[PDB]
Design a protein around this ligand. Structure first.
Ligand SMILES: Nc1ncnc2c1ncn2[C@@H]1O[C@H](COP(=O)(O)OP(=O)(O)OP(=O)(O)O)[C@@H](O)[C@H]1O
Ligand SMILES: Nc1ncnc2c1ncn2[C@@H]1O[C@H](COP(=O)(O)OP(=O)(O)O)[C@@H](O)[C@H]1O
Ligand SMILES: Nc1ncnc2c1ncn2[C@@H]1O[C@H](COP(=O)(O)OP(=O)(O)O)[C@@H](O)[C@H]1O
Ligand SMILES: [Mg+2]
Ligand SMILES: [Mg+2]
Lengths: 458, 173, 513, 52, 64, 52, 460
């Protein structure tokens, strides 16, 4: 009952009778050759025209085709039936099994929970990772974000967190792959299915090959599946593989939607697009969502508008850096930029808090000397400041750890380090009780015991 | 070029002319308006920045072949939007919408030489089947084409000429 | 003898016989504008986005925009001779490229037109240039190895069939060399190869073709070329043509390898085409979708499971798995590994080989910089023997290279750091290698054996070269069977470890090099 | 050296086929313009209208 | 050359009578909706900063 | 071998001069199904035979 | 008969409107009567409706609207061939010197396509310039591009004149000098410095200088190049000098801004790399002949990353940088052996002996460069004896890189020498292999071959 009138890249304009124009976010349908193409309207231009985004390949569309108005928004399968299966942005099953026997379908556009319904939790969550749970401990039901450039470890860290908390966790889990490699999605699907945990994970995948609209709405499609388990009374884990692609897909489409560019070419509505998503991924009195989000920062510029506007939406922020990863120090967390809302004397105890702050102080004091060391050499440093440097370097190395998911790279077996066991090692290194041991005794060891043991072999 | 800005006005003028069964009067009124735009002195006036409602009035003055309300009103609206120069194209799209409504087409026939007027009859009869429209013919003669015929129906052409066959064979090799 | 005039005449005769004279109805439009290679066509009520529009002459144009009243298109060739008013014909074809195994050994334009003088193509139909890569369920984990000729990358940075491995560095550091040395090495391993050159000088391409012919590899490679002089719409569309030619092998259960000579110049040509359309630019003036440009390209280099190969080929091929391996090359200014486009492609591929200029100027070639180059498929893509001997060798060289930074002045612990330094130094002196000298997995393996099981402390930095030359000649002379065995298999066992130790002490003692 | 000998064989074969091809169509054109008349025009027009 | 909300049926109304009824100075009609901005046709007596009342119980601020 | 190929080329060209006049007629008759006589074309076919 | 009419004039951009079916094709030339003299317009774009947008190859002041425009059916065409040697011409191939008409017979269009893939030479030769420093440390490929990054007061013009002389005498090639966008004073004094050394009859000059509208500075390089191509088709080996390629970039940036196209990387036109490529891809060695090119390059803001140098260096094969220091010591030519580079220096192309001789002298000089600082701070006799020998050989090598030019006789008085490559390799192997240690460093200075250094030491 409508005609196409323009096809610019990924956006399509459709003309309808004045009295039947669809509403915003309703879904239309066309026939692109043999296939059926779903459009989602973004704007109601004047005169019955409506401007839409194609959820599929836009090639092959002529003008004047006839499009049908489906009178409901995009709706996805939801609930228990969607568990252990892979789905499109449109909720269609993408593994070669049959239909999803869903009893209910939910619109992917929803309002965030009211302020009255929110809930706050001080219950610490423990992970096997030294640096994360010393510098930036995070709590059940809270948001976590791994900030880093390209190729620094923010996917390997997310797979390690999945390993350490997701298998030892009762409730279900949801994994949304937003604009990342299909290879990694296949690898993760098969690793899960081979350990029989797949029947606890729901997967959504709008990987990098797909046109902008799929990457644009796949994140919402995942949040809906998560919100369902939350409202059912359960507690959920939500892993988003790269939330930067959700805004990159908005930037790709913005100019075609006829909107004046902004700070660095970004859409004028960047902060609202980002908030309208991250405000509904929260825990509430009727259930809790625990979420880990990888956040790519373009060109390693931590001040680009997209990371800068994301920082405000996370409780614990872990900032990876290339200058550390280039030292072979994995994980490459930058201890002088990672933080957590949960690092307070009240929440984590005076001993943990004090050790974390001492480590920060030492590493910063070492940063301040790095230029005088560069120009004048290390022999000009006062004897007090040469001890600071050696302890700083020992601490730099002791934050490294082997991961079970990185055996494929280094061959060394992974390690799981309890919190009680790491604050002790750092208290020791700082207080000086290990101040007679070569630095390389600390590279890639689990606990301080293993370091004093490795020193025997040099 | 005003191909795009003329569409709303042509559509509105045609929908109005239908309600009152005056399509022929509207078409002639528009054909006169589009000629008032081409006069050497009026084209000077349309460019200089006059206030829309005085430009519209001085344009209405030069035309007494426009019916009291509805032609004058169309001129006033286009003048308010500053689009009086678009009239020559409003006319073309009005003629097009009319041809579509009355289910008519006008197909060109290009030949090396005039046709037998039985050939023309068969061509019109065949096209009136290819197209639902009653079709006019205006045969034309070109001698670069050397045998066969070209039938052009809007943006659809049937390259029956032998010149086409030659150029299409040369590029097979 | 073989200039059979009767053969030419029969060819043309078959063509004249295999003709179609019946007329056909097509849709027409008129060019309204021409500027900087972009065309504006009025009419074509029945054009479809992505279509090929045919212009006066035999040139083509691609439809990018279907505006309300006009079609926007870019000319795939010299546009200067087009003029307003010319008619154009809408072919019902989305952008298509000849594909087949008959293209092997030809040098081809981005539209598939052969630019060498050797006449028309034999090809198995046409493939769409723009396609969506296989889904997540259709992939399979990369298992098999792809052997380059170089100890450095085959040991530290393995490449598996189906991987995508960025070769990144500064100008004149040996990228093209490292890539065509991987192309030459597949001469006998059954992997068809494709080399696409975007924005290169014509002299360089002619020279590279002459080398590919000098080592016999040309009969196994397709060359898709869009030189620095060609339109920005051929440069921008070339790598998609090359990937469409490689997917032909991928989808039939075979193996292929494709090299994009500069995906930095493709980005520049796309930036040109985008700015000429007045599209708001982003960082470094690149468009918004400069990531999607490389994403939808490199995501096609995939490995597919046997069910995809069956379903695609209508069941003609059972049990096989196809793969397309990609080696995109990127150029970075002043070694700046943190610009926009370099970082995008590092974020799209499955690793990077980072060629550093300080090493290249110091005579270390291939100048692989360990500590910045990784292979995210890790050892899964190595042969068992290589995976064993190599181990953490790369992080070992990274440690040695950083230690050299501080030991430059002075060091303590100065016997263990001393033996560490000597070992690492001899290893770097052993990893450098000459151009056009590939060495089988057997030779790399036994040389790494000699490197790791001591056996090299005594021989000087001046003799490493000689040690290797002798070692390899001796083993070629005597233990030809053991080489024939290690080359046929992953070939690792305590039996083979013992055989190698025996050869090592024999050469070490009785041979004098 | 043998490789280039073979490639030059191929290239000369193609070079010759090209000339043969272009001259075939130029001759066909001149023959046609030299041989068409009312009968052939009428035949072509009638045969295309019969399938128009 | 681009349109300015000159659309078919509004133009047709103006053809019917140029000097259209002025009674509706207090109300208008939504012609566009996007990203939280709406264009309203009419409202001859709107004042800058005024509050405009939409269907339901919602308001908009007239800025342009 | 190149100086051999040149002689091969002349050798074959002199033969293909006979085939141009065949292919031109075959094309002209394929494009217009009205058969054509060699007689009236015997002259212009000769320019093709000559210029190859 | 004229058919168009000027409709807009804005700075150097002029719009003319033709009948709907007579619209000129892009790059076609047009002309108008700008008062008492004709003016040539080059088409840049076709807008709709028979309107076409052009750029004036001249001052556009005085242009009314409605002037008639005559549509030349061809691009700008210039005279080419032997007739242009020793003349001076502007972008349109008009004799700008006052010695009258050019007596050419043939005229070529300046817009052309690069040689196809199968026209290029299936070999890789070298060009024997005849200068020791260049032939050793930065050899020229025949048909390659050479950047000349020297500054001022170092002898760029006399190096250019020596290359012109040698390539005319010791080969049978001519030369073309395109003066893209540089001072008029240097053009006039170059014309004179060449007329009084008898090389003016061996070079064809085309000048578009800083005082010209943008179109002239844009197309002058194409004029020079399309004369060099005519010389190539005769089978010669030709040499093409560009006075500054950076100004050929900047004129295109100005023009692109005039046309209103969106800016790109750091202020440059969006078509930077294609404008540079369609020039640099026409000077190549063809199966019939070859055009070599020596191009002066200016790096903005001392940044080798700026888009213009970064785009240019993609095409340069060699690179010779002149140094004020090496001149101060008195060594002429003033090439810097440590910064001059060439991608022809590989054993696989130049051979192992030349490669390792060049690398030898490079290592010797780059050690001496710091032994001399150790001397400057600690005094001479602090050195080791091995190092004193290194210094004593480095000084000799450094002296031997001087040469007397046939063009420099007017300064040195000594007769000019042309040194073949073999002789330079021999001389430097000898000086580096420990031969000739028995004669003083001033026996090598400004000599020529080593077989003349021995003779100079004999009489010293
Ligand atoms: N392993 C090696 N040993 C010695 N020389 C080498 C080696 N690899 C490359 N080279 C030399 O480096 C030179 C330039 O290398 P190459 O052209 O492959 O780099 P590139 O990055 O492709 O250059 P460009 O970026 O200009 O294309 C080659 O001429 C080659 O001689
Ligand atoms: N714990 C670790 N041990 C070894 N390598 C690691 C570790 N963590 C990360 N890496 C390295 O990080 C590199 C980047 O991988 P990945 O995390 O997928 O990049 P991205 O940040 O884009 O996801 C890998 O190739 C791997 O070698
Ligand atoms: N080969 C040479 N022999 C003697 N003197 C030279 C030689 N080359 C350059 N010079 C001197 O160097 C000076 C630089 O002059 P000039 O070439 O005009 O400057 P520029 O090269 O910067 O234009 C000249 O005055 C000239 O005397
Ligand atoms: Mg990742
Ligand atoms: Mg290269």
């Amino acid at each position: 009952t409508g005609k196409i009138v323009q096809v610019i890249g990924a956006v399509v304009d459709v003309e309808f009778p004045q009295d039947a124009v669809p509403r915003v976010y309703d879904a239309l349908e066309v026939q692109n050759g043999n296939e059926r193409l779903v459009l989602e309207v973004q704007q109601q231009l004047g005169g019955g025209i409506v401007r839409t985004i194609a959820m599929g390949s836009s090639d092959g569309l002529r003008r004047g085709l006839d499009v049908k108005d489906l009178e409901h928004p995009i709706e996805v399968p939801v609930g228990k039936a969607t568990l252990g299966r892979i789905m499109n942005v449109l909720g269609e099953p993408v593994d070669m099994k049959g239909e999803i026997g869903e009893e209910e379908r939910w619109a992917i556009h929803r309002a965030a929970p009211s302020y009255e319904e929110l809930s706050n939790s001080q219950e610490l969550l423990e992970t096997g990772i030294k640096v994360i749970d010393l510098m930036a401990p995070f709590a059940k039901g809270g948001k976590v974000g791994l900030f880093g450039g390209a190729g620094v470890g923010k996917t390997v860290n997310m797979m390690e967190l999945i390993r350490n908390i997701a298998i030892e966790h009762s409730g279900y889990s949801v994994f949304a792959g937003v604009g990342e490699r299909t290879r990694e999605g296949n690898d993760f699907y098969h690793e899960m299915t081979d350990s029989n945990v797949i029947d606890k994970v729901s997967l959504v995948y709008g990987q990098m090959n797909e046109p902008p609209g799929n990457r644009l709405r796949v994140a919402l499609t995942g949040l809906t599946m998560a919100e369902k388990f939350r409202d059912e009374g359960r507690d959920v884990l939500l892993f988003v593989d790269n939330i930067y692609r959700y805004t990159l897909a908005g930037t790709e489409v913005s100019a075609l939607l006829g909107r004046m560019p902004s700070a660095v070419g970004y859409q004028p509505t960047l902060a609202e697009e980002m908030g309208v998503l991250q405000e509904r991924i929260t825990s509430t009195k009727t259930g809790s969502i625990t979420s880990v989000q990888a956040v790519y920062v373009p060109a390693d510029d931590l001040t680009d508008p997209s990371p800068a506007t994301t920082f405000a939406h996370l409780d614990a922020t872990v900032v990876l850096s290339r200058q550390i990863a280039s030292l072979g120090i994995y994980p490459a967390v930058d201890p002088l930029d990672s933080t957590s809302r949960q690092l307070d004397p009240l929440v984590v105890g005076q001993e943990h808090y004090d050790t974390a702050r001492g480590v920060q102080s030492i590493l910063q004091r070492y940063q301040e000397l790095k230029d005088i060391i560069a120009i004048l050499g290390m022999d000009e440093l006062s004897e007090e400041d040469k001890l600071v440097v050696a302890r700083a370097r020992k601490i730099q190395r002791f934050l490294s750890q082997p991961f079970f998911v990185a055996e494929v790279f280094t061959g060394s077996p992974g390690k799981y380090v309890s919190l009680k066991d790491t604050i002790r090692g750092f208290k020791g290194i700082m207080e000086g009780e290990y101040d007679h041991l070569p630095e390389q005794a600390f590279y890639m060891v689990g606990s301080i015991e293993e370091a004093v043991e490795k020193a025997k072999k040099l | 070029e005003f191909i795009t800005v003329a569409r709303p006005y042509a559509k509105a003028a045609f929908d109005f002319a239908v309600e009152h069964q005056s399509v022929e009067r509207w078409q002639d009124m528009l054909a006169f308006a589009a000629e008032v735009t081409k006069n050497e002195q009026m084209a000077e006036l349309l460019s200089g920045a006059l206030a829309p409602e005085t430009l519209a009035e001085s344009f209405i003055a030069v035309a007494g072949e426009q019916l009291d309300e509805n032609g004058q009103n169309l001129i006033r609206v286009m003048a308010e939007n500053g689009r009086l120069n678009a009239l020559p194209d409003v006319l073309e799209q009005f003629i097009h919408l009319r041809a579509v409504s009355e289910a008519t087409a006008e197909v060109d026939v290009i030949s090396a030489a005039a046709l037998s007027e039985q050939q023309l009859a068969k061509i019109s009869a065949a096209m009136e089947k290819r197209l639902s429209r009653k079709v006019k013919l205006n045969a034309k003669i070109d001698k670069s084409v050397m045998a066969g015929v070209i039938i052009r129906a809007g943006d659809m052409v049937i390259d029956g000429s032998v010149r086409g066959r030659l150029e299409r064979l040369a590029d097979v090799l | 003898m073989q200039l059979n005039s009767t053969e030419i005449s029969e060819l043309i005769k078959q063509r004249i016989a295999q003709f179609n004279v019946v007329s056909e109805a097509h849709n027409e439009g008129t060019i309204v504008s021409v500027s900087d290679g972009v065309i504006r066509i009025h009419g074509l009520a029945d054009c479809m986005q992505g279509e090929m529009i045919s212009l006066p002459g035999n040139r083509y144009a691609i439809a990018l925009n279907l505006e309300r009243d006009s079609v926007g298109a870019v000319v795939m060739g010299p546009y200067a001779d087009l003029a307003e008013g010319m008619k154009v014909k809408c072919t019902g074809r989305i952008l298509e490229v000849p594909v087949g195994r008959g293209l092997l050994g030809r040098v081809v334009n981005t539209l598939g037109a052969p630019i060498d003088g050797k006449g028309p193509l034999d090809h198995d139909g046409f493939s769409a240039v723009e396609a969506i890569a296989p889904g997540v369920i259709e992939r399979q984990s990369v298992d098999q190895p792809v052997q380059t000729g170089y100890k450095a990358v085959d040991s530290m940075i393995p490449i598996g069939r189906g991987q995508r491995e960025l070769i990144i560095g500064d100008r004149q550091t040996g990228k093209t060399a490292l890539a065509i040395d991987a192309i030459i090495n597949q001469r006998d391993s059954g992997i068809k190869c494709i080399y696409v050159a975007i924005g290169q000088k014509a002299s360089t391409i002619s020279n590279v073709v002459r080398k590919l012919e000098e080592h016999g590899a040309l009969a196994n490679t397709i060359v898709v070329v869009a030189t620095a002089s060609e339109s920005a719409a051929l440069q921008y569309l070339a790598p998609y043509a090359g990937c469409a030619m490689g997917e032909y092998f991928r989808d039939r259960g075979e193996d292929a390898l494709i090299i994009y000579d500069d995906l930095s110049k493709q980005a520049v040509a796309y930036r040109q085409i985008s700015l000429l359309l007045r599209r708001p630019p982003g960082r470094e003036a690149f468009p918004g979708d400069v990531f999607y440009l490389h994403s939808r390209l490199l995501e096609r280099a995939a490995r597919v499971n046997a069910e995809y190969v069956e379903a695609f080929t209508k069941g003609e091929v059972k049990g096989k798995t196809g793969s397309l391996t990609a080696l995109p090359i990127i150029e970075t200014q002043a070694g700046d590994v943190s610009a926009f486009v370099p970082t995008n492609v590092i974020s799209i591929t499955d690793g990077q080989i980072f060629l550093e200029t300080n090493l290249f100027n110091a005579g270390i070639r291939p100048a692989v910089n360990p500590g910045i180059s990784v292979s995210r498929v890790g050892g899964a893509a190595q042969t068992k023997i290589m995976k064993k001997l190599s181990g953490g060798i790369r992080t070992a060289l990274a440690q040695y290279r950083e230690l050299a930074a501080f030991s430059q002045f002075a060091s303590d612990l100065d016997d263990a750091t001393r033996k560490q330094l000597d070992h690492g130094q001899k290893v770097t002196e052993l990893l450098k290698q000459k151009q056009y000298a590939p060495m089988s997995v057997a030779q790399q393996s036994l040389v790494l054996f000699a490197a790791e099981r001591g056996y090299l402390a005594d021989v000087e930095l001046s003799k490493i070269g000689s040690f290797e030359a002798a070692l390899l000649a001796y083993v070629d002379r005597d233990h030809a069977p053991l080489m024939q065995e290690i080359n046929q298999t992953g070939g690792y066992n305590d039996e083979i470890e013992g055989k190698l130790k025996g050869i090592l002490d024999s050469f070490k003692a009785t041979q004098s090099w | 050296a043998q490789a280039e000998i073979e490639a030059e064989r191929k290239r000369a074969r193609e070079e010759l086929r090209k000339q043969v091809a272009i001259l075939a169509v130029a001759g066909a054109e001149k023959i046609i313009e030299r041989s068409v008349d009312e009968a052939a025009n009428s035949d072509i027009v009638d045969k295309l209208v019969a399938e128009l």
